[PDB]
Design a protein around this nucleic acid. Structure first.
Ligand SMILES: [Zn+2]
Ligand SMILES: [Zn+2]
Lengths: 191, 135, 95, 91, 118, 76
RNA sequence: UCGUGCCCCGUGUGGCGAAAGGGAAGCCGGUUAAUAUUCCGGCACCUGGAUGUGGGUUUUGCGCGGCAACGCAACUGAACGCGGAGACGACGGCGGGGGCCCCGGGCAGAGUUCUCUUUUCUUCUUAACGGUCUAUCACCCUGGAAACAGUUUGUCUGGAGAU
RNA sequence: GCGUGCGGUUAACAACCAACUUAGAACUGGUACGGACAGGGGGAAUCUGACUGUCUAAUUAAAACAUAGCAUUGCG
């Protein structure tokens, strides 16, 4: 893993207009079931270009222009504030608060559904992949589409080696010995 | 209608002069024995004149207003034709097929092209031809 | 409609299939129609439109892909763009 | 010449892991090792590079797709409803 | 005849920096010769193809050879290939032409809006 | 070591200031003669057919350049 | 020069940590009781610096040639940027090259020889560093392919231009 | 020694060079013929753990442990 999968920082261009970036690479991230996208944007304040790392939605490709900001179009891969999208759309990498560069609906095949808007206090009601209903600020950003790599868990692992290769890069504990298989000194379920 | 005619402005896409702007001196659509394909005899700019600001001196202006030309036989597949035109009778029959067979004739043709192009640039017209393409 | 006209043009008139032959027809200036498939690369499509604009040649944007354009021509290979040089008995030019 | 009656690509597993699990893994293996027609160049040269990554050998374009297929039916239905929602919003 | 050899350095492990090849000396003996790793051909920055005409050397070997050996006499020569340079030229020209066209159409629309307002 | 295929270039090399010494090697089995001049960086070898003019090239070679004939045995 | 100031830029923060990772460059012959890619002889290379000579460029000021892929001993290039190299898994068969093994002829030497064996065995070698001529992939030009063609042990390639 | 315009697919022919497999037949010795070496005993069932794998170094290698699959709970 090289860089965390985050949005651009919320700046003047995304707050008032839009900014165009180009997708250079779609790469595999070890430990993550979803591919990442390297997108290069322009720096509005200097000559040097800025490279970002997003979670790639399904349908994105290399050489594609994506647009991030308030005035960006309703297209897969575009990053929009939730106030600029209609009801019923699905988005990805949803910010819990505007400026945290994405927190919700990030794993493969998952998305967040924009249930509704309340423009009186600038709130947006959203539906999470767990079925929970949440209320976020309407200026929180999300990438239009569904996270790529869905259907990953429909394939049986079928082998201890494949489970080992999965969990060795994800650092989760494997193999898992049962508490009832332990001594009473080791587990409350021991014995 | 045909557009690869005399005084047609084209962009060279391959070779040492790739990205440079040329004017067609002679279109050879039927081809020759040496070049059995549709080609053209063109004259163009190898080194574009530099930019001029309002505070430069006259000597620096006349130093930076110089143009290095070239003459070329080029395939049609290595040209990108443009809608612009550059009509000069000073470049009329400046090069022929036998021009490229003698090194001195190429130098004389390049001198003539340099004089005509420098006069047209100092006139202040056809600014797109003397502006280099950025890519 | 467009497929039937293209098939009758294939039967009667003269066409060239492919990018290089289409460019040659546009450079010769005898091209009467240019067809560009939907899945043509955008740079190639823009270059073909520029060539047709300089040669005063109409352009039809085929809504199918190169596979479907080749099938509509009646060939067993893909075709990103084509040039119709002779309409034959069809009315594809009058549109 | 057909060599196996029903296991197909799952014949590499022999008698292990169960008939039901072999039948479950067979369809994913077939759809993840099949070749696909490219939507950019039209050639049949799109193959899986990694998890959800599908690369074309001819035009060198890399796309983000499903884990074992190029396109997910949920993603296709998403594209359809996004197109109609965009048409409603613009109109 | 003794045909078996030994390493000529103190590293006894077959690592990527421990490549040897067998030579026969003018003294009639078989011997090893420690060799460097193979140079890699420089590649295009757009498509990633190997750039023709450019030698494949280790990175500090390029400081000892002259400029015309390390490059091709073209724009982006030795950094981009000819097909990519051609694509860049055509794309730049077409996009600038469409920028001029869009500016002309925007000016016409602005003039029409001003005439409608007046 | 470098091989010179031009008599004019070999004459200029022998007249270079860094030419410390020169030697003549005779190979009668091949019937050839070799003029080897020791410069600062390179030893330059001119290969000729064994002939009277090849012997008379010594007269065109400079006098101050110490030239010697290679013996049959390289005694240490 | 109101002479004792003004302008530009943002990227941060140091050190240790691999005699198997990365990495600038040396080969052959001989030599000691004991060291040797370290010594001796011959023949090289790398890095850095200073400053000459020849050659090159230039009165069309910063080269010329090739349609092109590109080539040629040179052939200006600060800030600021882009890219490449360094820089990369495991396994399977296929092809090229070096070394080894094996077969035949020849010179020289050695052994066998009651009988046979034009016999059996041994030496017959060529380094680093350079020049020059060539070597799969790939790319370029012409041209436009169905009666589809080319093609690998392995079925891939081609109007996005194949043979 | 090359450039065209033709004409022909019995080269289905000549010359030179080359290595290892496979099959078939006769003859012949025999107490032995994979002659030493090298090298599965096989079968009918029952219990048991799905399998590959791991542990009590120095008395227990297993129906123990792990494994893939399945089920439940908590967390926006
Ligand atoms: Zn493709
Ligand atoms: Zn390229």
């Amino acid at each position: 893993r090289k860089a965390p999968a985050k949005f651009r920082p919320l700046d003047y261009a995304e707050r008032h207009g839009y900014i165009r970036g180009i997708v250079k690479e779609i790469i595999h991230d070890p430990g993550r079931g979803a591919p990442l996208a390297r997108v290069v944007f322009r720096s509005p304040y200097k000559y040097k270009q800025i490279t970002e790392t997003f979670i790639a939605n399904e349908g994105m490709y290399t050489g594609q222009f994506i647009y991030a900001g308030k005035n960006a179009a309703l297209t897969v891969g575009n990053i929009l504030p939730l106030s600029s999208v209609p009801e019923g759309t699905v988005v990805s990498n949803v910010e819990e608060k505007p400026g945290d560069r994405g927190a919700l609906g990030r794993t493969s095949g998952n998305y967040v559904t924009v249930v509704g808007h309340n423009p009186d206090e600038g709130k947006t009601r959203i539906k999470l992949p767990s079925g929970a209903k949440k209320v976020v600020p309407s200026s929180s950003r999300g990438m239009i589409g569904i996270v790529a790599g869905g259907g990953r868990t429909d394939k049986p692992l079928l082998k201890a080696s494949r489970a080992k290769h999965k969990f060795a890069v994800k650092r989760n504990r494997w193999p898992k010995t049962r508490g009832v298989a332990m001594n009473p000194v080791d587990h409350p379920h021991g014995g | 209608m045909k557009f690869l005619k005399t005084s047609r402005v084209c962009l060279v896409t391959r070779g040492r002069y790739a990205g440079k702007k040329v004017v067609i001196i002679q279109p050879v659509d039927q081809g020759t024995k040496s070049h059995p394909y549709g080609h053209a005899l063109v004259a163009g700019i190898e080194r574009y004149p530099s930019k001029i600001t309002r505070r430069m001196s006259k000597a620096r202006i006349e130093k930076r207003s110089k143009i290095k030309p070239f003459i070329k036989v080029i395939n049609y597949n290595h040209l990108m034709p443009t809608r612009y035109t550059l009509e000069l009778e000073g470049l009329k029959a400046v090069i022929n097929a036998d021009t490229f067979k003698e090194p001195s004739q190429r130098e004389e043709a390049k001198k003539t092209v340099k004089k005509v192009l420098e006069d047209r640039y100092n006139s202040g017209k056809n600014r797109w031809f003397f502006t280099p393409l950025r890519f | 409609s467009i497929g039937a006209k293209l098939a009758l043009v294939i039967k009667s008139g003269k066409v060239v299939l492919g990018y290089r032959s289409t460019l040659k027809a546009l450079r010769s200036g005898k091209a009467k129609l240019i067809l560009i498939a939907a899945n043509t690369p955008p740079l190639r499509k823009s270059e073909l439109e520029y060539y047709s604009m300089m040669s005063k040649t109409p352009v039809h944007h085929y809504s199918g892909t190169n596979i479907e354009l080749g099938t509509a021509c009646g060939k067993l290979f893909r075709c990103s763009t084509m040039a119709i040089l002779d309409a034959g008995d069809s009315d594809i030019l009058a549109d | 010449s057909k060599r196996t009656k029903k296991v197909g690509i799952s014949g590499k597993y022999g008698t292990r892991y169960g008939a039901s699990l072999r039948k479950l893994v067979k369809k994913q293996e077939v759809t993840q090792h099949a070749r696909y027609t490219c939507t950019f160049c039209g050639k049949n040269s799109v193959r899986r590079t990694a998890v959800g990554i599908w690369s074309c050998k001819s035009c060198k374009k890399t796309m983000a797709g499903g884990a074992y297929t190029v396109s997910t039916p949920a993603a296709a239905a998403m594209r359809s409803t996004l197109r109609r929602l965009r048409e409603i919003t613009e109109a | 005849a003794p045909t078996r050899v030994t390493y000529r350095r103190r590293n006894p492990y077959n690592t990527t920096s421990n490549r040897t090849r067998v030579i026969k000396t003018p003294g009639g003996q078989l011997r090893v010769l420690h060799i460097k790793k193979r140079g890699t051909a420089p590649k295009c920055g757009d498509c990633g193809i190997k750039l023709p005409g450019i030698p494949a050397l280790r990175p500090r070997e390029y400081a000892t050879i002259s400029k015309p050996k390390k490059t091709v006499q073209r724009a982006y020569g030795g950094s981009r290939c000819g097909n990519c340079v051609r694509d860049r030229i055509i794309r730049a020209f077409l996009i600038e032409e469409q920028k001029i066209v869009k500016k002309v159409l925007k000016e016409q629309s602005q003039a029409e809006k001003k005439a409608s307002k007046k | 070591p470098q091989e010179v295929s031009d008599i004019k270039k070999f004459i200029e090399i022998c007249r270079r200031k860094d030419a410390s010494s020169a030697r003549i090697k005779k190979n009668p089995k091949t019937q050839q003669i070799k003029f080897k001049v020791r410069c600062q960086r390179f030893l330059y070898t001119l290969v000729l057919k064994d002939s009277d003019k090849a012997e008379k090239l010594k007269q065109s070679l400079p006098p101050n350049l110490q030239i010697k004939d290679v013996p049959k045995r390289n005694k240490r």
